[PDB]
């Protein structure tokens, strides 16, 4: 499809964000509105690699 929900979403994100990890990196930030904002769009609407990449950490 064009959407991702549940564990397939989580597995896809883990693979996409490699060793960097999630931007939303702590239990408390995974419950955040910003996190949910991205997740609700992927699941309910459309999810693409660009949207997914916004979910990743951005270390130097």
């Amino acid at each position: 499809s064009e959407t991702l929900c549940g564990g397939e979403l989580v597995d896809t994100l883990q693979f996409v964000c490699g060793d960097r990890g999630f931007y939303f990196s702590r239990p408390a930030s995974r419950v955040s509105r910003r996190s949910r904002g991205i997740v609700e769009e992927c699941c309910f609407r459309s999810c693409d690699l660009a949207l997914l990449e916004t979910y990743c950490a951005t270390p130097a």
């Epitope: 929900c5 549940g6 564990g7 397939e8 419950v31 997740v39 609700e40 769009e41 309910f44």
Partner: antibody, heavy 122, light 109 residues
């Protein structure tokens, strides 16, 4: 005491309309993605509908698309399922349920309504 | 294409204090995203276990879950009389977050 208290089930003729309500208490309702799940007589549980936490996005099982509408009113701490063009095969116990996780359904549904029966019959 | 869930056995009868083993299979790969619910007759299900082995809070330690290759098992160590219920698995990988049909556990007293 976290609680989902459902109301609104009953008897309705084929082609008819019913609206279920699920009133939440003991938690911050607006943080949670909410679910409708049904159980038809001698069948398994099945997803009906899901709504995001704000309410602005929704998703439906194929069997109900175009006919049911889920919504929520965060101000009143309540979840709704509007059931139209009701068919006999929609007869079931209807549960509301809260999302246990963060990625829409990835850790199951932790908190459940008590169930409300919906009978579609002449 | 929608993932189908299969349990074994569909029912069992076991004695208080026994170890009970219930299997769930997915027809496609669900990673480790498998939940267990306990449903007593005419009641809302109760979440026991999510992500194959994570016990939900308030749930007795006698309930445990395992991935078992490409199988999943719920274990009830020390079956109790309260445990009489249907135990159902649910894949949490994708839509439609499909529930299995359940395994009826009877207490052999």
């Amino acid at each position: 005491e976290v609680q989902l208290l459902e109301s609104g089930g009953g008897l309705v003729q084929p082609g008819g309309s019913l609206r279920l309500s699920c009133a939440a208490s003991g938690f911050t309702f607006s943080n949670y993605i909410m679910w409708w799940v049904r159980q038809a007589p001698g069948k398994g549980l099945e997803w009906v509908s899901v709504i995001s936490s704000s309410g602005g996005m929704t998703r439906y099982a194929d069997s109900v698309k175009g006919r049911f509408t889920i919504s929520r009113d965060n101000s009143k701490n309540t979840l709704y399922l509007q059931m139209n063009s009701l068919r006999a095969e929609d007869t079931a116990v209807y549960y509301c349920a809260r999302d246990n996780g963060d990625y829409v359904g990835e850790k199951g549904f932790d908190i459940w309504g008590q169930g409300t029966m919906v009978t579609v019959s002449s | 294409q929608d993932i189908q869930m299969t349990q074994s056995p569909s029912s069992l009868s076991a004695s208080v204090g026994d170890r009970v083993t219930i299997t769930c299979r997915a027809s496609q790969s669900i990673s480790n995203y498998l939940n267990w619910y306990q449903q007593k007759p005419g009641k809302a299900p109760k979440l026991l276990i999510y992500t194959a082995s994570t016990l939900q809070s308030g749930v007795p330690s006698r309930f445990s879950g395992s991935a078992s290759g490409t199988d999943f098992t719920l274990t009830i160590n020390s079956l109790q009389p309260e445990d009489f219920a249907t135990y159902s698995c649910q894949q949490s990988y994708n839509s439609p977050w499909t529930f299995g049909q359940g395994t009826k556990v009877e207490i052999k007293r």
